[PDB]
Amino acid sequence: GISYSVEADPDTTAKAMLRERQMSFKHSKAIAREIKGKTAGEAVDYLEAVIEGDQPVPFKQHNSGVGHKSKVDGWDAGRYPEKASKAFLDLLENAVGNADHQGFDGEAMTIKHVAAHKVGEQQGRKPRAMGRASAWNSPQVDVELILEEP
Amino acid sequence: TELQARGLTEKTPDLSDEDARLLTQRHRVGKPQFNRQDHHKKKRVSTSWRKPRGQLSKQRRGIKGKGDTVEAGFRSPTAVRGKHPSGFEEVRVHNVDDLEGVDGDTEAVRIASKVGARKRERIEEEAEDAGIRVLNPTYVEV
Amino acid sequence: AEFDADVIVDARDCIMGRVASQVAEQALDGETVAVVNAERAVITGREEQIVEKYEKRVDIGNDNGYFYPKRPDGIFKRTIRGMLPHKKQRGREAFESVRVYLGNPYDEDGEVLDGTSLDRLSNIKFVTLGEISETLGANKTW
Amino acid sequence: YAGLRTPAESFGSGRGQAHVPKQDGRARRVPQAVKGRSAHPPKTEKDRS
RNA sequence: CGCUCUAAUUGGAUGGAAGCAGGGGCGAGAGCUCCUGUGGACCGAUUAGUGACGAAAAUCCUGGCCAUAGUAGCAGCGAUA
RNA sequence: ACCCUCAGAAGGGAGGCGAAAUAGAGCAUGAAAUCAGUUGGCGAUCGAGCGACAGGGCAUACAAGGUCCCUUGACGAAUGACCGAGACGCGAGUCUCCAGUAAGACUCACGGGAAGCCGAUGUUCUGUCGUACGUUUUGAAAAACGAGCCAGGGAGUGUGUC
Ligand SMILES: [Cl-]
Ligand SMILES: [Cl-]
Ligand SMILES: [Cl-]
Ligand SMILES: [Cl-]
Ligand SMILES: [Cl-]
Ligand SMILES: [Cl-]
Ligand SMILES: [Cl-]
Ligand SMILES: [Mg+2]
Ligand SMILES: [Mg+2]
Ligand SMILES: [Mg+2]
Ligand SMILES: [Mg+2]
Ligand SMILES: [Mg+2]
Ligand SMILES: [Mg+2]
Ligand SMILES: [Mg+2]
Ligand SMILES: [Mg+2]
Ligand SMILES: [Mg+2]
Ligand SMILES: [Mg+2]
Ligand SMILES: [Mg+2]
Ligand SMILES: [Mg+2]
Ligand code: NA
Ligand code: NA
Ligand code: NA
Ligand code: NA
Ligand code: NA
Ligand code: NA
Ligand code: NA
Ligand code: NA
Ligand code: NA
Ligand code: NA
Ligand code: NA
Ligand code: NA
Ligand SMILES: [Sr+2]
Ligand SMILES: [Sr+2]
Ligand SMILES: [Sr+2]
Ligand SMILES: [Sr+2]
Ligand SMILES: [Sr+2]
Ligand SMILES: [Sr+2]
Ligand SMILES: [Sr+2]
Ligand SMILES: [Sr+2]
Ligand SMILES: [Sr+2]
């Protein structure tokens, strides 16, 4: 799996990670990109709004065929990846929790760093016409999160 | 408090007028990169030089813009060929006994990378006393 | 709206192509030029064949497009663009620092460039830019 | 006989593939094939004296 | 020029070998060499040999991987649940 | 191990062991293709064998390269004047002298200067040239054939005789 790709002073920061998550890697890049720089609490409110359908997640890179959303600012395509959002909520729950256990104010901390990495694929096979089978796999995702005092 | 290199680091060799002229020429004229044709168009094709062999090869046929092809005409001057940019002729050294017979006025010594810190210390102190410059010196805190 | 031109050229009774050539080079030399009295610029030859050529340029076109100007304003400007490498940076700079005007929006009188003058007492076979534009269907706003 | 213990056959033209002997979907025998024979290997019959 | 192993002669390495990464120097060039980081145990040179010795290509072989794409499909059958 | 988190023998956080956990289980090393994040350069008015060679911008910890710029002066190949004087030509212009003089690439010396400064490396802009590579062919950018990409694999070998 991954290792934190960014330095982190333990005196002013808290960490957290998700391991081998079977969820969209493409949705994860989008979600991280959008919540980075936010307050943990702000991120949670955001992700909950996404899951609810009130706030869209801008799909800037993986947008083929994605219909436009009026609430997306400065861009057009967007969706509501609720599964990956829930996984990120778990990540934030763990991070904020760690932060609190260390004496920090979890929710208030800034998401200094957050990035998803494709760690592999869970392999599957799907029978097709003409006597052959093709790949039918699940992405495996790791994601790192660093909360920093500010 | 600061880093200082061991040995005669600033030493320059004494060259004849003609040798200094040729060294200066080699440095002025230089030469083309001489990388394999199209090495930049394909990652599996390395930069290492290979004679363009294709019957239709643009570089092989010598079209301007397709890069120069290796020829003896590109050779550096005999009298200075192989010299370090400083003008010193290089001497590969693996131990102290390799310093014997070396002229520190004309030659500079280069300690092989495999040589350990222990042996390098001796080679370096012996080289300095013999008036020989060590091209790859150890930087000590002084 | 205000064009600080280093040179102001009077096109009245002057051979369009010859003016265009000099304005092109001057523009490439860094000069900011303003071609004034465009409607009175002149081109030699048989009116019928001249108009036939400009009419064909108006009729040419398709989805990609061949937008050819009908006013003396744009015709002269286009004539100049054809003598400038308008797709290169240096060429576009030159072209963009040149402007053609209907009438004379300046207080000064433009200067008549050497060799571009046409003597009406010695020529009967010529057409005015404004006359071509009228035939082309442009609204005579001059 | 190394690399030759296979009944591998080539499919020829028709399936968008190189005419390389295959067995159970694997290329076999030929020197360019992984697990294939060695083209010009050391030979016992060679006089080394 | 470079690769493997053999022999003779002669050297390097836990005070850090090979390999790898980034970078400096030399050679027309094959390619040689140094520095730094990683690595943690092996590595050369000369000379005489040995050869399963050099790849951009063969609809070449095997393995790994990207775009394709969050796309097609997850509707159609007299059993619409 | 213990503690915190969690639906949790999961995972995460902290922690403990060891020279090393970036040795924590297909667990020595860890290339390329390639992915995430990020740094430098370019970027929403502009054109396509992706570059070679020149030259500008911006970028650069050390080490392993240390050069480079301007005044002046010395040397000075081929080439080679202006000005002026005199003489011709309808004219554009030319001849003679000045003079093979001034100039003239490189290189060097004095004086002054640069340390992102010179080289170099990354990217980009400008100029010149430029329709891959290999093969088939009289003729290949080819609307002839081959290849998605990378790593590794992949073709003059043996006996006998001449
Ligand atoms: Cl994916
Ligand atoms: Cl030679
Ligand atoms: Cl049109
Ligand atoms: Cl142009
Ligand atoms: Cl007339
Ligand atoms: Cl010289
Ligand atoms: Cl042969
Ligand atoms: Mg759609
Ligand atoms: Mg079947
Ligand atoms: Mg390449
Ligand atoms: Mg085999
Ligand atoms: Mg020997
Ligand atoms: Mg090989
Ligand atoms: Mg394959
Ligand atoms: Mg599609
Ligand atoms: Mg019903
Ligand atoms: Mg490992
Ligand atoms: Mg070939
Ligand atoms: Mg034919
Ligand atoms: Na909006
Ligand atoms: Na919008
Ligand atoms: Na005309
Ligand atoms: Na038109
Ligand atoms: Na078998
Ligand atoms: Na194929
Ligand atoms: Na034998
Ligand atoms: Na540059
Ligand atoms: Na062929
Ligand atoms: Na070809
Ligand atoms: Na063709
Ligand atoms: Na494929
Ligand atoms: Sr896209
Ligand atoms: Sr070393
Ligand atoms: Sr001109
Ligand atoms: Sr057939
Ligand atoms: Sr081989
Ligand atoms: Sr895929
Ligand atoms: Sr249904
Ligand atoms: Sr730990
Ligand atoms: Sr002279």
**Residue with token string 């280069």:** B110
- Cα separation, C93 vs C114, in Å, equals 25
Which residue has the least CA–C1' distance to nucleotide F33? B43
Which partners does chain B have (≥3 C-beta pairs < 8 Å)?
none
Question: Within a 13 Å sphere around the CA of C98, how many CA atoms are in the beta-carbon half?
Answer: 31
Chain breaks in chain A (C to N over 2.5 A) after: none
D6/E58 CA-to-C1' distance in Å: 23
| Tokens matching residue B141 | 């805190």
| Tokens matching residue D36 | 């294939």
Which one-letter DSSP state was computed for residue A23?
A: S
Distance between Cα A57 and ligand 21 center (Å): 12
Q: DSSP for C115-131, please give it.
A: T-B--GGG--SEEEHHH
Question: Within a 13 Å sphere around the CA of B121, how many CA atoms are in the beta-carbon half?
Answer: 3
Distance between Cα D49 and ligand 26 center (Å): 8
- Cα separation, D7 vs D23, in Å, equals 7
| Tokens matching residue A11 | 């005196």
A37/E64 CA-to-C1' distance in Å: 36
Domains of chain A: 1-150 (3.90.470.10)
Residue spans per domain, chain B: 1-142
Cβ–Cβ < 8 Å for C60, C66? yes
Exposure string (b/e) for A78-99, b if CB count within 10 Å is 16 or more? bbbbbebbebbbebbebbbebb
Look at chain C and report how many structural domains it folds into.
1
Cβ–Cβ < 8 Å for A84, A31? yes
Domain containing C34 equals 1-142
A12/F63 CA-to-C1' distance in Å: 35
**Nearest nucleotide to A128, CA against C1' atoms:** E73
**CATH code (residue C117):** 3.90.1180.10
The amino acid present at B101, given as its one-letter code, is G
Query: Chain E bases under 7 Å from protein CB?
Result: 11-18, 25-31, 33-35, 43-44, 51-53, 56-62, 65-66, 68-72
- Cα separation, D30 vs A41, in Å, equals 64
Which partners does chain A have (≥3 C-beta pairs < 8 Å)?
none
Cβ–Cβ < 8 Å for B49, B34? yes
- Cα separation, B115 vs C72, in Å, equals 83
Q: DSSP for chain D, please give it.
A: -TTT----B---SSSSS----EETTEE-SSTTSTTS--SS---TTS---
User: Considering every ligand atom, which ligand is closest to the CA of C25?
Assistant: 34
